[PDB]
């Protein structure tokens, strides 16, 4: 069976509302727990969130660096975002947009990485535990993978997204966030607006460069 439609919307909502399941929302400058009604509203299907991001797009290094101009630690790293796109077959507009949301347009202090020994570790995609503490103990995905440079963190993030999400039939933002095939497991983030934020930047970049959209899917539930 290639049939990944497993749950009704109501069944999925109740699972997303389950015990100790971290769903969060930005209010008054920081993240708080989302209520059950906010969760249900967020997972409701309304198209960048629903677009397959497992294909390459024809963006040159010049075009990618345009997008990255004024983006902090990510500025003038378009060549490496493209190396990631071609190596791992990950949409570069998606990849850039995801990094921009997570790193605060490349300007956040956490985007400048975490020191340990003579190395510093970088993480631009919110992958695993990434804080002072976790790097110390070695319970950090970034350290395990030795993302010792920004370029390694770009390539490594794409490798992770491809191998852990795209190869797990989570092919667009909605599936990455809400995993309708298996609700409330293997979800990329706790922010209920995670997909919205990335999708917004993707859509701007699609309309800036006139890029053609890949497949859209809006059917996920019984
Ligand atoms: C991309 C990422 O890290 N999103 C984590 C998410 O973990 C997902 C499922 C994951 O893909 N985790 C990766 C790092 C890993 O491949 N799976 C688990 C790590 C579990 C974790 O991050 O806590 C493992 N192999 O041991 C975790 O559930 C949630 C609440 O803690 O906080 C999100 O920010
Ligand atoms: Cl959780
Ligand atoms: Cl070019
Ligand atoms: Cl993220
Ligand atoms: Cl969403
Ligand atoms: Cl338009
Ligand atoms: Cl389509
Ligand atoms: Cl549906």
Numbering used by the authors: 33 to 78, 83 to 258
Provide text from the study.
Two groups of enzymes, muramidases and N-acetylglucosaminidases, cleave alternate but chemically equivalent glycosidic bonds in the NAG-NAM polymers. The crystal structure of AtlE and its complexes with substrate fragments described here provide insight into the mechanism of NAG-NAM binding, whereas a comparison with structural data for lysozymes and their complexes with substrate fragments enabled us to seek out the structural differences responsible for docking of the two alternate glycosidic bonds in the NAG-NAM polymer. The compact α-helical structural core forms the lower part of both domains, whereas the R-lobe and L-lobe contain short α-helical and β-strand regions, respectively.
The structure has additional five amino acids (SNAAA) at the N-terminus remaining after cleavage of the His tag by TEV protease. In the MDP complex the NAM and alanine residues are unambiguously resolved by the electron-density map, whereas the positioning of the atoms of the d-glutamic acid residue is less defined, as indicated by the electron-density map. The O atom of the lactyl moiety of the NAM residue forms a hydrogen bond to the OH group of the Tyr201 side chain. The alanine hydrophobic side chain is positioned within the hydrophobic environment formed by the side chains of Ile163, Gly164 and Phe196, whereas the d-glutamic acid residue is disordered and points into the solvent. The opposite positioning of the lactyl moieties in the active sites of the N-acetylglucosaminidase AtlE and the muramid­ase ACOD predicts that features on the left side of the active-site cleft of AtlE are responsible for the recognition of lactyl moieties and peptides from the glycopeptides, whereas the features on the right side of the active-site cleft of AtlE should prevent the binding of lactyl moieties and peptides attached to them. Indeed, Figs. 8(a) and 8(b) show that in the L-lobe and above the −2 and +1 positions of the lactyl moieties of NAM residues bound to the AtlE surface, there is sufficient space to accommodate the peptidyl extensions.
